Amino acid sequence: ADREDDPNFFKMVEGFFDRGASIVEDKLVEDLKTRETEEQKRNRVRGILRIIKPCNHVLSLSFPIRRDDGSWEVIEGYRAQHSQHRTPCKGGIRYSTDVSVDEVKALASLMTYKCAVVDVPFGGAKAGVKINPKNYTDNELEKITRRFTMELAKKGFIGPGVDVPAPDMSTGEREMSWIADTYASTIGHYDINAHACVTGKPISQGGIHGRISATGRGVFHGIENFINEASYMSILGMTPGFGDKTFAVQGFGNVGLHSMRYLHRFGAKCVAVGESDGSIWNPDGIDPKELEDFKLQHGTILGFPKAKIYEGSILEVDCDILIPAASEKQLTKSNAPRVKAKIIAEGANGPTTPEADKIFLERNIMVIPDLYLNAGGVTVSYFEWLKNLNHVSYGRLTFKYERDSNYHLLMSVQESLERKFGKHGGTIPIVPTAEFQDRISGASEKDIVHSGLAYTMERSARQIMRTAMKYNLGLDLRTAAYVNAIEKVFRVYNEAGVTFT
Amino acid sequence: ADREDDPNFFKMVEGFFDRGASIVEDKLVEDLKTRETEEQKRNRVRGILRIIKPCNHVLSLSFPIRRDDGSWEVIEGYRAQHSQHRTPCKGGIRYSTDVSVDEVKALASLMTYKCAVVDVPFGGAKAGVKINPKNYTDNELEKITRRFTMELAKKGFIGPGVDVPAPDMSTGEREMSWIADTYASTIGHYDINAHACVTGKPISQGGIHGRISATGRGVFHGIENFINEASYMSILGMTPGFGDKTFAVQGFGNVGLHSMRYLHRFGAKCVAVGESDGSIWNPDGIDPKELEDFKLQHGTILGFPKAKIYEGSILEVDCDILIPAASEKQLTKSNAPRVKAKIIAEGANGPTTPEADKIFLERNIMVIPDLYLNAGGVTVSYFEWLKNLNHVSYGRLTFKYERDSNYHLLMSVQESLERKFGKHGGTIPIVPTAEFQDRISGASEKDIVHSGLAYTMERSARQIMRTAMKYNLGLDLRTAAYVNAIEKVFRVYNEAGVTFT
Amino acid sequence: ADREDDPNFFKMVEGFFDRGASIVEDKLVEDLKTRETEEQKRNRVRGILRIIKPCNHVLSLSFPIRRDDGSWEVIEGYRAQHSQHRTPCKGGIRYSTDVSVDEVKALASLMTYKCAVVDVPFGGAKAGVKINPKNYTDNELEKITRRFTMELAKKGFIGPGVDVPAPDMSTGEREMSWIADTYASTIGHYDINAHACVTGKPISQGGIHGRISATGRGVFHGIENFINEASYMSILGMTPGFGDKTFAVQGFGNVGLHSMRYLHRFGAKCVAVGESDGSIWNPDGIDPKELEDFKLQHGTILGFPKAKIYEGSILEVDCDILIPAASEKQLTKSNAPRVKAKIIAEGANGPTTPEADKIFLERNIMVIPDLYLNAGGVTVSYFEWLKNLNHVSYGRLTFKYERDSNYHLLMSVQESLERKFGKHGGTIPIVPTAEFQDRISGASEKDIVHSGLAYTMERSARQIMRTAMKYNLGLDLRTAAYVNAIEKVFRVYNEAGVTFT
Ligand SMILES: NC(=O)C1=CN([C@@H]2O[C@H](COP(=O)(O)OP(=O)(O)OC[C@H]3O[C@@H](n4cnc5c(N)ncnc54)[C@H](OP(=O)(O)O)[C@@H]3O)[C@@H](O)[C@H]2O)C=CC1
Ligand SMILES: NC(=O)C1=CN([C@@H]2O[C@H](COP(=O)(O)OP(=O)(O)OC[C@H]3O[C@@H](n4cnc5c(N)ncnc54)[C@H](OP(=O)(O)O)[C@@H]3O)[C@@H](O)[C@H]2O)C=CC1
Ligand SMILES: NC(=O)C1=CN([C@@H]2O[C@H](COP(=O)(O)OP(=O)(O)OC[C@H]3O[C@@H](n4cnc5c(N)ncnc54)[C@H](OP(=O)(O)O)[C@@H]3O)[C@@H](O)[C@H]2O)C=CC1
Ligand SMILES: Nc1nc2c(ncn2[C@@H]2O[C@H](COP(=O)(O)OP(=O)(O)OP(=O)(O)O)[C@@H](O)[C@H]2O)c(=O)[nH]1
Ligand SMILES: Nc1nc2c(ncn2[C@@H]2O[C@H](COP(=O)(O)OP(=O)(O)OP(=O)(O)O)[C@@H](O)[C@H]2O)c(=O)[nH]1
Ligand SMILES: Nc1nc2c(ncn2[C@@H]2O[C@H](COP(=O)(O)OP(=O)(O)OP(=O)(O)O)[C@@H](O)[C@H]2O)c(=O)[nH]1
Ligand SMILES: Oc1c(Cl)cc(Cl)cc1Sc1cc(Cl)cc(Cl)c1O
Ligand SMILES: Oc1c(Cl)cc(Cl)cc1Sc1cc(Cl)cc(Cl)c1O
Ligand SMILES: Oc1c(Cl)cc(Cl)cc1Sc1cc(Cl)cc(Cl)c1O
């Protein structure tokens, strides 16, 4: 992911952390619920922060699997649990040769800070299996994930109340299904909540509506919240709204594909899509549906008819909004001065280096941070988990009751008015509007996911704005986010019996 | 140190492994129970060996502890489990700033190879907590080990049937007691075998006789087995026996102190004792009991009256036998040409580098390998574990029965002879010899430990000699040991169904 | 099996049971520890016996497996637990299309009666998977047994202290290994005794010496105990001993092959070996070692050079002893009048029908019953289980102690005599005989298995003889066996909240 500026992903995130640690250190000694004072309160805060930064647990595994051609192979895997300040750890599983102890630790800590930003009660965790999925058959991949689950289960790295994985790079519903099945068929066979051991499951296996596209939907909302402020767009030299905007996304998987689908829906036009092979381009825009079909049938976006094979880094293309949705450290000190985009919407985790962040602050480029912007995935994963614990489809017990109820409520206003305006008025039909007619039986699963996600992205967005203001951070939203996150994680160690001298 | 051949400890052991892997690879394709043939049998062996080398599990921990002065501190710890080919993993816990992921992995794998050499049914494991014990109070140390136990317990890194720790550098009965107590009071409170979760415990807590001095006793036996062969001493230019031998030990702790006590008992005289501060020397010998008292009262061996402060590396002193009983990589390419000793008895784990091994083979210096020589500790740890599972003091149920039994057996020969040689002979008292009188009621715990250890060290010693011969390895006992070890670990992997038909 | 007499396998055993139930019903009302009397004591015995006959639990399973060619297949399986009067149930696993609910129930009950006869503290159990192993690959078989284990484990039909399987028809070490591995890697991963969940395991996986040939060895002993009584051979018209005897075995697997090996060792000559394809014959005898090689290389005994393909039912061949070691109901009312053999040694379970038993009693043919004769397998399975619970190789802790001990004991007689017969005698070396020299270090695993089995077969044999006498049952050993068995199982009921209250 670079040579000159390839800081260790974990140290990189610690940098992001330490930055916010400075900014809020005062509000913390303030809110510190201690009878002691001065330097002891200053010291205590530092001690607590020193606890939060390092990952509490990291499991490195080396297990064998029998390949299809009879041969034996040893594959490596890791799962790090950054924090248990909130009982169930949460974090996906990545399948890639790029994975390593440090990459996983970094991702794990990003998970807990992001959960805090978005108010999801999970400490962060992350897993990685060092393989290139494309070099294995479906049958070998199944053996790999099922075996990996058991090793995690035996050491306490997976379970409804201990640690709940989910998809990430090169893993999806299929893998999640295998994980759930392995867990429920063995260790959790007596557990009524066995299927809540993992999220991102297929809908038919206890998964939840819109989880696959949840990150993209969330990316849309995160951009929407800022792109409609004017108090922010005036500083970038842009008009609010999506209608006259162009964007380019690096990555065309679960994050990239859906981010693109949603932005295109509200008027923004996709100017370029990138992948590992390369990228494509078209100033008149590219349609998300057609591109997905081409990719689906040909296995690559390159060669797409309604566009041209671009030659010159998808990140440097000319557009209003750049959405890196691939891997980490894609924007560094080297390519940063060349982004051409005014808004960097981080769909991926850690796509920009700290050094690249500076250049972006100088060139007046707004970087909507990953720990807020991509949290739509974990947010809906939280909903999936909750659904598995309740064992019911949201609304099932209340549809008829709320429907009958709303009609009687409306009938109460109708009758009251006919009672008043006796014969003068006549019949005064009080009927639902078309919109309320669709909400007549109350919320369903799909409804809750959508409105719940929009609500979360909005609540957290304001929180970040209020914080950027209170500390005059300008377009340094990342720092505002870590500030909010440290504050929330602090609340748990602080007020807690532990730390009461 | 010395700055020259300071290799990755783990890689170093892998080197030792790969060496033996070559030497036995043929006897393995031979004993391979496969219907297939040629390269497939050759390939299968390589695949299995590739499984055995890497550690299966490594847990890295970062947990906080409240220091005595109220402050918060984060301490790091690790426990690696190299192999589970034998269900309970076994390995000590080291307290040192020198500990790291690699050091622990290396030690862990040495544990499994050593258990195999000595026929103890445990896969290897090892733990390390990165602290210098001397910079903490007893109360802080207790909090550190108890908390470390819980973290290991919750992730499956300690338990009677999963993983059984023991002492190592800077840990002893005290720490083991804390570990047992923490485990038994929490997770294992219902477990009838809870106290078998750890070994090296104080005798009053379920520990076993002679475990503290077990490594020293074993070091004595390992040296005895070779120093009395002539077929080996002729090649070193020495006479068999201990009576006219001198030795120097680097380290004066659990290994060093007892190795010294036992060698001194059979006539060998200790010429020099070394520690981290430095060493002392006296050509007429130093007495183990007096040196221990001085050390006990003054906290250091330096300044001992019946000896002089030596200035010139304890490893280079002039003597017949050198016993490094401290830490790893103490004998390298740099100091090797200067040992002056003909026999290097490795009390410590990995004290000599591979490059140092060559120089030792050329200068015709016999290196009695660590995976055999120091295994007296694990061997007796195995006895402690067995004792905890049986819940009885060895002999308690049989003392009176065997005593009465032996007298009637002896009376049977007495009466038979008086019956024959009627009045010619007269009374023909058949009485035990003084030695048999002490064995009249059968073995006690102490008896089983001593005779069990001697037996083990002897059985394994012959096995190594037979192997050094079969492959003409000369004074390369280390390689003979790994050969024996790979052979034994191999057998659990071979078997049909296991690595598959 | 016929169309004439092919009684229901279960009903058939109930018949055998009811027969003995009558014979001992009186000694039971006698030994009944009741204050009440007459018919109430008579009634209570009947009630208890009504409890013992039916199997307590039977699990029928239907689970899918993915065949190698991608297709899906549903396989059927069952495991019955006849009695829990002794906590761990014990019984093998059969792979055959002949398996069914009734066959397994019958086998299960035979297991508990046989364990009682042989004094092994296990209630009986049995499993069967309805497949012909030859129509599946090794990989499919592995999936089949591993999946079957999990289904049994989840419903409490396998575990160290609940139910311990073992081999039977078409299953061996390999399958047992898969079972142990599946159990220990999942449900029993924390269990220190996980590997005792099954027996008949490969030696390198915790199996025990001589388990494979244990049934054959036991068959030898069972025949030996009766063939050397004269008080029994006079009634058959035979001389005691093996030297001048000929035999024919139906079945050349784990039971048949070893029964043949052991009888041939003590002078008896094998005249014919049978299999499903057919049989072979040679009046001068057939050598067990050569026949095994031919079978091993060609997959069939037919066509063996040092013998001829026999055409006429292996059971009707002319010989002194007939050993049916295949499946049940091979000797019925139809072929019984044609056995030509004076002794029927039942290696297999239920090879003779009740109706065939009559004809055998009339023709004065002694039928050494299966519940005694083939119990060598379970007996040694019991030793394997015990070994797994103790986690040590028998003798390992005591070899050197007992060796040193015996020499001092012998030295005590030597010194006592030299003390007496001062200079008259001179040196009076007291040295072990060659035989005692091999027993100098005490018993090893192999020693305990052999001597423990011989002891058991002998103790039970006398018990049966004493019972055949006390009731003048003549050559009706089967009934004597069930009498002994009901007595032992009933004892457990004549005191467990049963006869009481
Ligand atoms: N639920 C989720 O999955 C969530 C994921 N995220 C974030 O998004 C990333 C996950 O993407 P998912 O894992 O969603 O993506 P998926 O694996 O589908 O992404 C696939 C795309 O990534 C592209 N890609 C990979 N590496 C590069 C590269 N070096 N340069 C250009 N393109 C590249 C692939 O091209 P190609 O196929 O040729 O390699 C492919 O188009 C994570 O890092 C994570 O932080 C955040 C929240 C939720
Ligand atoms: N059961 C057991 O304990 C077993 C131990 N071993 C081996 O021995 C080691 C364990 O020793 P224990 O843990 O037994 O030792 P203990 O801590 O008692 O050893 C204490 C001694 O180690 C000396 N020491 C440490 N570092 C150095 C150095 N760089 N140079 C010179 N001397 C040094 C100390 O000097 P100072 O006090 O000034 O630091 C002290 O005299 C392990 O590495 C292991 O491989 C082998 C088998 C079993
Ligand atoms: N641990 C144990 O296994 C124990 C077993 N036993 C007894 O031994 C029997 C088990 O044998 P295992 O199951 O040991 O035998 P294994 O499957 O090895 O027996 C294989 C032999 O059975 C022969 N066979 C099967 N059916 C017939 C038939 N209808 N006619 C002629 N030969 C046949 C086979 O011929 P083919 O290959 O062509 O089918 C083959 O030679 C049981 O009934 C049991 O009572 C008793 C105690 C312990
Ligand atoms: N690739 C792709 N996936 C889709 C599409 N439509 C639905 N899905 C699946 O369903 C989820 C997307 O749901 P949405 O289409 O965004 O739901 P919605 O249309 O916004 O719901 P409404 O606003 O009430 O109409 C993902 O998890 C997909 O698996 C599509 O057009 N393309
Ligand atoms: N306090 C103290 N304890 C010691 C000393 N030396 C050894 N020990 C400890 O106890 C042994 C003491 O053994 P006894 O003194 O009980 O040993 P023993 O039975 O004569 O040993 P053997 O002669 O080899 O059979 C070791 O296990 C040490 O842990 C010493 O000098 N002082
Ligand atoms: N299939 C088979 N296995 C055998 C035979 N002979 C011995 N065994 C084995 O008994 C083995 C170890 O046997 P040893 O200790 O060398 O046997 P012995 O030499 O003590 O064996 P026996 O002659 O049966 O008493 C197991 O691994 C079995 O495979 C045989 O003829 N056929
Ligand atoms: O680990 C496996 C082994 Cl030994 C054999 C097979 Cl046929 C598959 C696997 S993967 C796996 C699958 C499940 Cl359902 C459970 C576990 Cl415990 C597994 O390891
Ligand atoms: O972990 C500890 C906390 Cl939070 C507070 C205190 Cl006063 C001690 C400890 S150490 C410890 C000791 C035991 Cl007996 C059990 C556990 Cl669970 C410990 O962590
Ligand atoms: O049941 C299986 C599934 Cl669903 C997938 C694979 Cl590849 C193998 C099996 S068999 C099996 C093997 C193990 Cl080790 C554990 C379990 Cl519970 C199994 O079902």
From Swiss-Prot, chains A, B, C:
CDD domains: NAD_bind_1_Glu_DH. The modification Phosphothreonine is found at T353. Its main location: mitochondrion. The modification N6-(2-hydroxyisobutyryl)lysine is found at K90. It is found in: Mitochondrion; Endoplasmic reticulum. ADP binds at S393, R459. NAD(+) binds at Q84, H85, R86, D119, H195, K387. The modification N6-acetyllysine is found at residues 27, 33, 53, 105, 114, 126, 130, 134, 154, 269, 289, 295, 306, 308, 329, 333, 342, 358, 400, 420, 423, 446, 470, 488. ADP-ribosylated by SIRT4, leading to inactivate glutamate dehydrogenase activity. Stoichiometry shows that ADP-ribosylation occurs in one subunit per catalytically active homohexamer. GO terms for biological process: glutamate catabolic process; glutamine metabolic process; tricarboxylic acid metabolic process. The active site is at K126. Belongs to the Glu/Leu/Phe/Val dehydrogenases family. PANTHER family: GLUTAMATE DEHYDROGENASE (PTHR11606), GLUTAMATE DEHYDROGENASE 1, MITOCHONDRIAL (PTHR11606:SF13). This is Glutamate dehydrogenase 1, mitochondrial. It comes from Bos taurus (Bovine). The gene is GLUD1.
